[PDB]
Design a protein around this ligand. Structure first.
Ligand SMILES: [K+]
Ligand SMILES: [Mn+2]
Length: 514
């Protein structure tokens, strides 16, 4: 009994690869898939924060659909304080990224009276700012001022995670009379969803404009933009960002139909993507969700752009320690699907078991990462890029191939720009990728890329390239051994440059571990 499910990796047919999976075949020490965690009241604390890091958190999310700049910044300080707390040990310091989550076109309910359930009976919506204080079972206030121009008589309306379905029956300039199809206990400040109606709310709102620019000041590494349908919308966020936020990544989250419908354009303009299941679910018929998930992920893999899979990956775990049999198939399959990053929203913010959440995202990810059919995968991926004759593409391809043959312990890529490493992760190797940069943004952002295990060089630049290179290499070397990625006489591929100002890692080597 082999390890890393290698007996399955040998199969000729997919069926045989599945047939060959073994519960008793041990995964490796490293984790390739990233884990994006959404911080909230349950995980804001520096002590809570650090342990979260130590558990496995890579990226820290900041949901701006809720929150004051004051609150967000505190969240930030903290994230970096727990982050830089480990910084005195170079070989065991884990860089952590920070991400902003925008609130694009987002209808949200009003407030309920300080004294709210609904039956298969009638209710009425109001936009007049007077019932906003008192939102009784009989009356509700929407955030959207242009609601009566979008929806028609018979048109359905959803709220509180599509949990409550409202059928439309009547109109008015300042109203809408609606019946309850599927109703229950209506909360306070729940968001509505208008599937099959056109939201005319701007992609980028004053608040979003405000929120974004602030990101620029907080040195956030990437922006998760909500509700993207067009590419022109992607542009707008780039504009709002400007030169200062030149180096920030723009990950478009698909939440609508138009979004799935106009994905190529979006993909191009984007720098990453996010499958925002929580919203799309409401937006498109939920039975259709998996289809849009795989299309998306597959398309992003073929393209070389990082992709995120989120919303309700381990819900149940919010109140309960152990996930469900389906929570676990969801997360495992998502890794198989080939998502470069998984993510927790409820389980790590509101959550009662925050850490226990991260831990299982990590355990499931390791097992699902080896279940992958790396041989077919790379052939299937090589074929697609067959049109490209890039040099790094070539060099990435080689390295991955050669790591399959000699069963490498890891791939060590010395980058700055982080491109070279990006380019190799793209080739879905089966071993960890140790990227070594002196650039911080680069390290922090490298999480977005599957397989990449960033390390950062605090050491000055030395005179001889040869020695600088051997300087960085060594570190990689040292850091793998400690983390335990590889032992004393293991083999490992190294990718560097021949001479400075190389532009790309054009030198490959097969160097045993000292
Ligand atoms: K949001
Ligand atoms: Mn959303």
């Amino acid at each position: 009994i082999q390890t890393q499910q290698l007996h399955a990796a040998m199969a000729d047919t997919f069926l045989e690869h599945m047939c060959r999976l073994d519960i008793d075949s041990a995964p490796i020490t490293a984790r390739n898939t990233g884990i994006i965690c959404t911080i909230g009241p349950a995980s804001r604390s520096v002590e809570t924060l650090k342990e979260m890091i130590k558990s496995g958190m890579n990226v820290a999310r900041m949901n701006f659909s809720h929150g004051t700049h004051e609150y967000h910044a505190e969240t930030i300080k903290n994230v970096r304080t727990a982050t830089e707390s480990f910084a005195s040990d170079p070989i065991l310091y884990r860089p952590v990224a920070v991400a902003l989550d925008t609130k694009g076109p987002e209808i949200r309910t009003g407030l309920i009276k300080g004294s709210e359930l609904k039956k298969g009976a009638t209710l009425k919506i109001t936009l007049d700012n007077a019932y906003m204080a008192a939102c009784d079972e009989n009356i509700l206030w929407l955030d959207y001022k242009n609601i009566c121009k979008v929806v028609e008589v018979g048109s359905k309306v959803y709220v509180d995670d599509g949990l409550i379905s409202l059928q439309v029956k009547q109109k008015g300039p300042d109203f809408l009379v609606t019946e309850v199809e599927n109703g229950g206990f209506l909360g306070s400040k729940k968001g509505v969803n208008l599937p099959g109606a056109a939201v005319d709310l701007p992609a980028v709102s004053e608040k979003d404009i405000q929120d974004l620019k602030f990101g620029v000041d907080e040195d956030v590494d990437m922006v998760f933009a909500s509700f993207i349908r067009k590419a022109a919308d992607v542009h707008e966020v780039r504009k709002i960002l400007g030169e200062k936020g030149k180096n920030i990544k723009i990950i478009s989250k698909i939440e609508n139909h138009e979004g799935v419908r106009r994905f190529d354009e979006i993909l191009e303009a984007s720098d990453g993507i996010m499958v925002a299941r929580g919203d799309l679910g409401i937006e498109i018929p939920a039975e259709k969700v998996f289809l849009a998930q795989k299309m998306i992920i597959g398309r992003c893999n073929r393209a070389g752009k990082p992709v995120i899979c989120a919303t309700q990956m381990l819900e149940s775990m919010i109140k309960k320690p152990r996930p469900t049999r389906a929570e676990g198939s969801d997360v495992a399959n998502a890794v198989l699907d080939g998502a470069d990053c998984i993510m927790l929203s409820g389980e790590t913010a509101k959550g009662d078991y925050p850490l226990e959440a991260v831990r299982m995202q990590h355990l499931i990810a390791r097992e699902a990462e080896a279940a992958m059919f790396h041989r077919k995968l790379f052939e299937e991926l090589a074929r697609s890029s067959s049109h490209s004759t890039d040099l790094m593409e070539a060099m990435a391809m080689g390295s991955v191939e050669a790591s399959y043959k000699c069963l490498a312990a890891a791939l060590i890529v010395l980058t700055e720009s982080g491109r070279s490493a990006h380019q190799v992760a793209r080739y879905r190797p089966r071993a960890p990728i140790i990227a070594v940069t002196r650039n911080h943004q680069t390290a922090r952002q490298a999480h977005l890329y599957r397989g990449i295990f960033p390390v950062v060089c605090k050491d000055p630049v030395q005179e001889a390239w040869a020695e600088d290179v051997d300087l960085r290499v060594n570190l990689a070397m040292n850091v793998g051994k400690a983390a335990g990625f590889f032992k004393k006489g293991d083999v490992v591929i190294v990718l560097t440059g021949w001479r400075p100002g190389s532009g790309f890692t054009n030198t490959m080597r097969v160097v045993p571990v000292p």
